[model samples]
Target: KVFGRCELAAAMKRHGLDNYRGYSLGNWVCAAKFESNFNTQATNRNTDGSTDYGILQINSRWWCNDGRTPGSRNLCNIPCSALLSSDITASVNCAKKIVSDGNGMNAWVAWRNRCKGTDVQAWIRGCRL
Candidate 1:
């Protein structure tokens, strides 16, 4: 199941800020799956006294640049439904901003060799599907 395309569009809208093509959506799906199983409301603690959260594994400790940090809250706290919503271009793009930030593949690539997985239909890892 491809879950959502509008959500992908949201991710892409955000990607365009950095002016990237729509090739990164597969990685978004991957990062969300590996980090929180796509749970927009997920949060986790790392041994480095830091935390990762949200659909795109926003490493809240260092994922921010300036005013974009969601503060001390997790998941950006916009809304789970917003991150996973049908009309979610802005929210999804927000998540993408936190993930892609010109990392090429985003955090989702950590799950696999996403650089070679350009098929779009190719499952990111053995888990994202």
Candidate 2:
């Protein structure tokens, strides 16, 4: 509920996501749509008992902590709840870290399942980039 497609794309580009590892802007837009529909406060419990947090849906098992999960790797050195805010800085930082660790967007199941090998162009339609 935080963004329509155009606003999201512009914000992401301004924040440097558009050129992340030479990835297509459309894929980022597509991931954002399927991940949490741009809802920064979004959280979901995985079947494995881990939770996906915020706009990127970062995982508790490897990323952040919500006080419920113990012994988080805390790789981004951030509180999981921090990603739930609409600010997006922390989430984007962590997401960049995830990608840098060689995971790329594969850290997101939504990207793998919903976005991979698909025609993602519509996600960026009408956006100036």
Candidate 3:
């Protein structure tokens, strides 16, 4: 399922991402926009043989185990397939672990290049959340 911007905002907020790790809900919304264009089943295979999965593009290298990524840490202890679910519960949980592991939001390249230090609040301005 592809989420509308405001819909995604509301979902993330309901899941406790509003001020998670000091990053606002808008920050997460903007990052998801760039990461997967709000597509729940998005996946990207890296040249290095690892794949990123789901809306937030959680990687197979360290977060989720895809069985194809060599030496995967699977820190979230979940199958990469779980991240692709429209429910988004697994994706949000893994993302929280990513940010909490000292990587901050920089774990996501899109967030670093687009959301960081930018006016992300615009992403959720009309969401009424």
Candidate 4:
């Protein structure tokens, strides 16, 4: 599903990510923009040979199972395809678990490389809080 950045932010707010669990809306929006450009079905193969899934682009190494791959904790306890849905609730819940598990936003390499230390304010620019 194609989601405008602002619409995606609103959904994140409702999903308990408006400063949810110690993270800012800025981090969420910025990471989403880079991770999958807000595309829920987004998937990519990392250099490590694992696939990433969803708007958050969660990795199969520890978070999800793509079925073709082995060795996933499936910590989110849902098929990787579940992350591909236009509805983001499942992804949000899984992200909450991931962060709470101490991975924090660093669970997303995109977040670590792009959103981290950046002035994330730009990510939410023009979106009404």
The most accurate candidate by TM-score is: 3
Off by over 4 Å in 1: 1-24, 64-91, 98-102, 106-109, 112-120, 123-129
Minimal lDDT window, size 10, model 1: 64-73
User: lDDT for each of the candidates?
Assistant: 0.47, 0.83, 0.94, 0.85
After best superposition, candidate 4 residue 39: deviation in angstroms?
Answer: 1.0
CA displacement after TM-score superposition, residue 76 of candidate 4 (Å): 0.8
lDDT of 1: 0.47
Compose the digit string of candidate 4's lDDT tens values, residues 65-108. 77766665777888888899999998899888888887678877
Give the best candidate by lDDT.
3
lDDT of 1 by residue, 1-129 (tens): 133434543544454522344554554555445655655556566566555545554554555222334444343434333443433353455654554566545454444553335564343323322
**What is the Cα-based lDDT of residue 18 in candidate 1?**
24
How high is each candidate's TM-score?
Answer: 0.48, 0.91, 0.98, 0.91
List clashing residue pairs in candidate 3.
none
Candidate 2 has a TM-score of 0.91
Task: Give per-model CA RMSD.
Answer: 7.2, 1.4, 0.7, 1.4
Residue 110, model 2: Cα distance from true site in angstroms: 0.9
Which residue pairs overlap in candidate 2's backbone?
none
Q: Between which residue pairs do clashes occur in model 4?
A: none
- Candidate 3: regions farther than 4 A off: none
Per-residue alpha-carbon lDDT of candidate 3 for residues 1-129, written as tens digits (9 for 90 to 100): 999999999999999999999999989999999999999999999989999999999999999899988877899999999999999899999999999999799989999998999999999997867
Distance from true position, residue 51, model 3, in Å? Answer: 0.2
